[PDB]
Amino acid sequence: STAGKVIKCKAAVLWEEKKPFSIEEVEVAPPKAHEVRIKMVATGICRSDDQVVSGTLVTPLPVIAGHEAAGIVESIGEGVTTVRPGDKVIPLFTPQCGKCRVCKHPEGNFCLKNDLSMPRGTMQDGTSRFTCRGKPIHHFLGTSTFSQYTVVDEISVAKIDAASPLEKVCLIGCGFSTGYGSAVKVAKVTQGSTCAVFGLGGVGLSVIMGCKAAGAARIIGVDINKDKFAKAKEVGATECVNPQDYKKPIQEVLTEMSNGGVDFSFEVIGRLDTMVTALSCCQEAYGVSVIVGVPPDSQNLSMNPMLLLSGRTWKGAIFGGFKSKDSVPKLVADFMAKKFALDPLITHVLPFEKINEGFDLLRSGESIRTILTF
Amino acid sequence: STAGKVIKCKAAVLWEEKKPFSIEEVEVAPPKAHEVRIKMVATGICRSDDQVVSGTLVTPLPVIAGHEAAGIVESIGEGVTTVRPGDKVIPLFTPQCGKCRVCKHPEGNFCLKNDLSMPRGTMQDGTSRFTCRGKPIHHFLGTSTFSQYTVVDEISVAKIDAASPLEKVCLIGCGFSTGYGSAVKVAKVTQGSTCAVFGLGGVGLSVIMGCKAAGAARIIGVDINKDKFAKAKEVGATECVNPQDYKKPIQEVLTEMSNGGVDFSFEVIGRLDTMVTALSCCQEAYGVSVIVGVPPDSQNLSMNPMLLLSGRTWKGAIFGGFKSKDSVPKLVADFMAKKFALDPLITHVLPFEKINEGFDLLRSGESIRTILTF
Ligand SMILES: NC(=O)c1ccc[n+]([C@@H]2O[C@H](COP(=O)([O-])OP(=O)([O-])OC[C@H]3O[C@@H](n4cnc5c(N)[nH+]cnc54)[C@H](O)[C@@H]3O)[C@@H](O)[C@H]2O)c1
Ligand SMILES: NC(=O)c1ccc[n+]([C@@H]2O[C@H](COP(=O)([O-])OP(=O)([O-])OC[C@H]3O[C@@H](n4cnc5c(N)[nH+]cnc54)[C@H](O)[C@@H]3O)[C@@H](O)[C@H]2O)c1
Numbered sequence: 001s002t003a004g005k006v007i008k009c010k011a012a013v014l015w016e017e018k019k020p021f022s023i024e025e026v027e028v029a030p031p032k033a034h035e036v037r038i039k040m041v042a043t044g045i046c047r048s049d050d051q052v053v054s055g056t057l058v059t060p061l062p063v064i065a066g067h068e069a070a071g072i073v074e075s076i077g078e079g080v081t082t083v084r085p086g087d088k089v090i091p092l093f094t095p096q097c098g099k100c101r102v103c104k105h106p107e108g109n110f111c112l113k114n115d116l117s118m119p120r121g122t123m124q125d126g127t128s129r130f131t132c133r134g135k136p137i138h139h140f141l142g143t144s145t146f147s148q149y150t151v152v153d154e155i156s157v158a159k160i161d162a163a164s165p166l167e168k169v170c171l172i173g174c175g176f177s178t179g180y181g182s183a184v185k186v187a188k189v190t191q192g193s194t195c196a197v198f199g200l201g202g203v204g205l206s207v208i209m210g211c212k213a214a215g216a217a218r219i220i221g222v223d224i225n226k227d228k229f230a231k232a233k234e235v236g237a238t239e240c241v242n243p244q245d246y247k248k249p250i251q252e253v254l255t256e257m258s259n260g261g262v263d264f265s266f267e268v269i270g271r272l273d274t275m276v277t278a279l280s281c282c283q284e285a286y287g288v289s290v291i292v293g294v295p296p297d298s299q300n301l302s303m304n305p306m307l308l309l310s311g312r313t314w315k316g317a318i319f320g321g322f323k324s325k326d327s328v329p330k331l332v333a334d335f336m337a338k339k340f341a342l343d344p345l346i347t348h349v350l351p352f353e354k355i356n357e358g359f360d361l362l363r364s365g366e367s368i369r370t371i372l373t374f
Numbered sequence: 375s376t377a378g379k380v381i382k383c384k385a386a387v388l389w390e391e392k393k394p395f396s397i398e399e400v401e402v403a404p405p406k407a408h409e410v411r412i413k414m415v416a417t418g419i420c421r422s423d424d425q426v427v428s429g430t431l432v433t434p435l436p437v438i439a440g441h442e443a444a445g446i447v448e449s450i451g452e453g454v455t456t457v458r459p460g461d462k463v464i465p466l467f468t469p470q471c472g473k474c475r476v477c478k479h480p481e482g483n484f485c486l487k488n489d490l491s492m493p494r495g496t497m498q499d500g501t502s503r504f505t506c507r508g509k510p511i512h513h514f515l516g517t518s519t520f521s522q523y524t525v526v527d528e529i530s531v532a533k534i535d536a537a538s539p540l541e542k543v544c545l546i547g548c549g550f551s552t553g554y555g556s557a558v559k560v561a562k563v564t565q566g567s568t569c570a571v572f573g574l575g576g577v578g579l580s581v582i583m584g585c586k587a588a589g590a591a592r593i594i595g596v597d598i599n600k601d602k603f604a605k606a607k608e609v610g611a612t613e614c615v616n617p618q619d620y621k622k623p624i625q626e627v628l629t630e631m632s633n634g635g636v637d638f639s640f641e642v643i644g645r646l647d648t649m650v651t652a653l654s655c656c657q658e659a660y661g662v663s664v665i666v667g668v669p670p671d672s673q674n675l676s677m678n679p680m681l682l683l684s685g686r687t688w689k690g691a692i693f694g695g696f697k698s699k700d701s702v703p704k705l706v707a708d709f710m711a712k713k714f715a716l717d718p719l720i721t722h723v724l725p726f727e728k729i730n731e732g733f734d735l736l737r738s739g740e741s742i743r744t745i746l747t748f
């Protein structure tokens with residue numbers, strides 16, 4: 001029996017910015033009313049977790065990061081109706097409370113209960129379930145998956161198919177759904193269109209998958225790391241360009257390549273300059289540019305609003321525009337029905353104890369997704 | 375009689391920025407192949423014409439400005455098929471060539487033959503039909519309606535109903551169509567939604583008209599000139615706010631008023647700060663903000679891209695997103711069938727010879743549209 005008891009387990013604690021994760025024993029309190037304690041099975045390394053280490057994505061420290069994961073329900077608090085002990089689950093770093101104006105809106109998904117806009121690093125009730133060396137440790141996006149056990153609010157967890165392979169479908173918790181939805185739900189890429197995708201990591205490859213599923217005729221991958229090009233072509237890029245190879249700015253190159261601008265562009269990096277470049281390279285009268293990358297804390301971009309007055313559309317989205325709790329079980333069912341592939345995103349599978357090695361693979365340009373296994 | 379001959383007539387020539395128009399004799403060449411010479415009957419004063427005087431909308435000087443007008447065809451050049459002498463016409467400041475990628479696109483209207491993006495101040499053939507004091511004078515947006523006679527390319531004119539009242543339907547050539555289309559075609563305002571309209575001049579009032587036609591439940595007019603409020607309520611504003619009345623920035627006021635941000639916001643002024651404020655006041659997950667104002671030449675705004683990443687859509691449009699030559703005749707037919715009103719926009723009527731008085735009325739805040747009659 002662990003139910004109703006404090007669990008002592010292993011977690012990766014980030015005590016301060018720009019330091020390795022500390023793998024050590026934490027205490028995980030039992031779930032309170034409407035909370036779920038999960039035994040983690042697999043978690044991916046997303047660039048957003050690295051941005052917490054870099055300090056470009058601000059959230060209270062010390063913290064248990066990790067938000068792209070899957071595991072099995074260990075216990076439920078009073079009042080929980082949507083999952084049961086032994087269920088396979090994906091934590092939802094964007095919650096779906098079902099009650100707020102956004103959850104009720106046909107097109108909104110950025111639930112007002114999210115912990116991304118103004119991060120507190122707590123449970124919904126403003127407290128933490130984690131202690132380490134006698135110190136309270138913050139949560140991250142209501143998920144905190146870099147731990148053998150986490151506690152999540154019910155609105156931050158989805159039940160998934162009992163037969164799903166958790167070492168793959170953890171990517172539906174972030175990278176796959178974010179990129180794929182950015183193309184199919186947020187941009188609504190059209191058949192025969194020309195798309196430009198800036199950044200060919202796990203999220204950008206998932207954007208390419210979505211553009212190809214939507215029947216784009218041309219998908220131009222843009223990355224400064226030419227080692228990313230082969231995999232981008234495998235999942236649907238028709239051509240790849242490295243801005244470092246050109247004397248002209250890449251917006252000019254992409255405008256000429258697309259005979260006056262692309263139909264859809266996607267920023268999947270998190271730099272202010274590429275967000276402006278991505279907007280500029282879409283057709284000035286009817287182009288659509290989607291910001292997917294997380295921009296650096298408290299920094300403003302500079303842009304000429306004439307880019308919008310001619311007719312461009314600029315938008316961004318969290319988690320691919322998916323209503324998280326409705327969508328994640330459906331995406332897992334679609335994966336089980338072979339409607340899309342996740343293996344092309346997975347370059348490395350490491351034990352959890354090698355989390356730091358996994359982060360160094362990402363930082364060095366050598367990995368797409370490392371999956372950590374508990 | 376005048377067919378094939380130079381016409382000497384009076385025009386309002388702008389010789390230099392920040393000076394009154396000079397009403398004096400010009401020579402108007404006869405139309406070349408696929409050109410149409412028009413006897414002007416009525417023209418409106420749009421803030422964009424004033425921005426030419428201010429130098430914030432840059433176009434080559436000296437120039438004959440004016441782009442919101444209606445008149446009667448005097449003659450047609452060789453090969454013209456879409457109008458005849460004696461037809462009532464509205465010049466199209468956004469052309470519709472019908473051949474370019476934009477014209478063929480289901481959404482696009484900003485035809486690649488436009489003279490707004492990189493203004494030359496010519497006919498399509500890169501030459502001028504106007505001489506004054508023996509000096510060639512620039513055209514403006516292919517229309518140049520501040521003249522008793524103008525010459526336009528055929529792709530820059532539409533035939534309208536022979537019975538239409540030209541002293542009213544001239545507004546379909548800019549202000550009404552631009553504001554009304556921004557709401558009904560660009561934003562696609564929904565029934566029961568909350569809109570905010572920044573700037574309550576001729577184009578903002580037309581945005582309100584369009585929000586009311588689309589069935590918005592709340593239309594919040596925003597202007598620093600409270601004299602604009604009464605007419606905004608007459609055409610559908612449910613409430614008006616003056617930012618100068620508040621201690622807090624108006625995006626915060628509008629967010630409070632709309633219990634978390636508006637469905638649709640429109641910047642109909644032409645200022646960088648209000649373009650950012652109008653984006654901020656739309657709901658962060660599903661809000662839509664439309665730029666209608668013409669921003670000051672070559673100036674960039676600064677904004678935080680987190681405003682978009684949460685889910686906002688930001689876009690702009692010229693001429694309300696209408697394909698100009700398809701749309702203008704239909705808009706006149708709908709006016710003739712009492713589907714919308716133009717009189718609320720018309721505050722003042724003057725003879726063409728009092729054009730400077732007409733610009734003084736706009737600059738003082740006193741007018742919405744002054745209609746000049748030739
Ligand atoms: N919107 C969301 O919900 C969401 C969730 C997941 C990820 N994120 C963000 O999405 C971005 C991509 O995440 P990821 O795929 O895990 O990251 P990643 O795997 O590091 O991929 C980034 C790619 O960008 C490339 N790159 C870096 N700089 C440039 C440049 N100047 N020009 C062209 N290419 C460049 C880089 O070589 C790499 O292949 C990051 O900012 C994440 O924080 C957002
Ligand atoms: N997109 C297009 O196709 C298109 C064509 C027509 C007009 N325009 C532009 O649209 C804008 C409006 O044109 P218009 O209606 O003729 O102009 P207008 O009659 O001058 O209306 C503008 C309104 O903005 C108000 N205003 C000025 N500054 C502020 C402020 N800081 N905060 C709130 N209100 C303010 C002002 O009091 C006025 O009532 C101008 O920038 C035009 O150049 C664009």
Ligand SMILES: [Zn+2]
Pocket residue numbers: 095096097098099100101102103111112113
């Ligand atoms: Zn919610």
Ligand SMILES: [Zn+2]
Pocket residue numbers: 046047048049067068174175
């Ligand atoms: Zn992520």
Ligand SMILES: [Zn+2]
Pocket residue numbers: 469470471472473474475476477485486487
């Ligand atoms: Zn065209």
Ligand SMILES: [Zn+2]
Pocket residue numbers: 420421422423441442548549
């Ligand atoms: Zn105008």
